[PDB]
Paper text:
The membrane-bound protein EssC is an integral component of the bacterial Type VII secretion system (T7SS), which is a determinant of virulence in important Gram-positive pathogens. The protein is predicted to consist of an intracellular repeat of forkhead-associated (FHA) domains at the N-terminus, two transmembrane helices and three P-loop-containing ATPase-type domains, D1–D3, forming the C-terminal intracellular segment. We present crystal structures of the N-terminal FHA domains (EssC-N) and a C-terminal fragment EssC-C from Geobacillus thermodenitrificans, encompassing two of the ATPase-type modules, D2 and D3. The observation of protomer contacts in the crystal structure of EssC-C together with similarity to the DNA translocase FtsK, suggests a model for a hexameric EssC assembly.
EssC-N consists of residues Met1–Leu195 folded into a two-domain structure with each domain representative of the β-sandwich FHA fold. Residues Met1–Glu91 constitute domain FHA1, which is linked to FHA2 via a short dipeptide linker (Glu92 and Gln93). FHA1 and FHA2 domains consist of nine and 12 β-strands respectively with the domains aligned almost perpendicular to each other. The domain–domain contacts are mainly via van der Waals interactions between side chains. A pronounced feature at the domain–domain interface is Trp5 nestled into a cavity formed by Leu162, Pro164 and Tyr165. Hydrogen-bonding interactions also contribute to the domain alignments, with a network of three glutamines (residues 3, 93, and 167) and a water molecule interacting at one end of the interface. Seven residues are missing from the model of FHA1 due to insufficient electron density. These residues (at positions 19, 20, 53, 54, 80, 81 and 82) are located on turns linking β-strands. However, as reported by Tanaka et al., motifs common to many FHA domains and residues implicated in the recognition and binding of phosphothreonine, as exemplified by Ki67 are absent from EssC-N.
Numbering used by the authors: 1 to 18, 21 to 52, 55 to 79, 83 to 195
C-alpha cells in the first residue's frame, strides 16, 4: 500500500494511492473530503512523480513528500506519506496482560511514532493514550482510555494496529517494527 494520512482538527483520514493526481478539498467528489475547511487558498493537489509526491496548493508547488515524510499547511492540516511499501507483522499476545508502545528501552513495540499502552481486562483490551503522542481510533483522536472491539483500528502517522482476535495483534508500518513480542509469522 501507498497511503496518505490527512490530519486536521481531531481527525485523521487514511487514503490509498492505488489514480495519479488526487485532490483534497471540501466537496464530496474530491478524493479526500474535509468539509469543515474553506480551501480559499486552493484545494490541495497531490500528484505522483515516477519516488516522490508533488504537493501543490493553487496549482503551484509548496512541497514534495518523500516516503515517511509529512507536510503541514495553512488553510492547519498535516499530510504525511508512507512511501510506496508497507509491511505487516502479527504478534501472539494471548499470554500478555499489557503491551507498551513507545520509545522507551523496555517497550514491547519500539517506535518514535506513537506512545500508548494496551491493557487486558477480563478478556478485553483497553487503549490508554499518552497526553503527548496523538493517536486515532477509527479516525478520531483519543482523549482518554477506551475499551476496544475487534477491527477497531488504531492509527498514528505511519503505523496501524489492529486486533485480529483477542490474542493476535497486527501492526502495519512503513519501517521494520522492533518488538519483544512473539511473532506468529514471518513479516508480510
Amino acid at each position: 500500500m501507498s497511503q496518505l494520512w490527512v490530519l486536521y482538527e481531531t481527525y485523521c483520514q487514511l487514503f490509498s494511492l492505488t489514480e495519479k493526481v488526487i485532490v483534497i478539498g471540501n466537496q464530496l467528489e474530491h478524493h479526500v473530503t474535509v468539509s469543515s475547511f474553506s480551501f480559499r487558498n486552493g484545494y490541495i493537489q497531490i500528484e505522483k512523480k515516477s519516488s516522490t509526491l508533488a504537493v501543490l496548493q493553487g496549482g503551484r508547488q509548496i512541497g514534495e513528500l518523500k516516503p515517511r515524510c509529512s507536510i503541514t499547511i495553512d488553510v492547519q492540516m498535516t499530510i504525511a506519506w508512507s512511501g510506496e511499501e508497507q509491511r505487516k507483522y502479527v504478534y501472539y499476545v494471548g499470554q500478555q496482560s499489557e503491551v507498551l508502545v513507545s520509545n522507551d528501552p523496555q517497550a514491547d513495540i519500539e517506535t518514535t511514532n506513537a506512545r500508548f499502552s494496551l491493557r487486558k481486562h477480563r478478556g478485553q483490551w483497553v487503549v490508554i493514550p499518552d497526553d503527548d503522542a496523538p493517536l486515532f481510533l477509527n479516525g478520531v483522536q483519543l482523549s482518554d482510555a477506551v475499551s476496544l472491539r475487534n477491527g477497531d483500528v488504531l492509527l498514528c502517522p505511519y503505523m496501524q494496529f489492529v486486533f485480529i482476535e483477542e490474542d493476535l495483534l497486527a501492526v502495519t508500518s512503513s519501517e521494520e517494527v522492533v518488538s519483544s513480542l512473539t511473532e506468529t509469522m514471518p513479516p508480510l
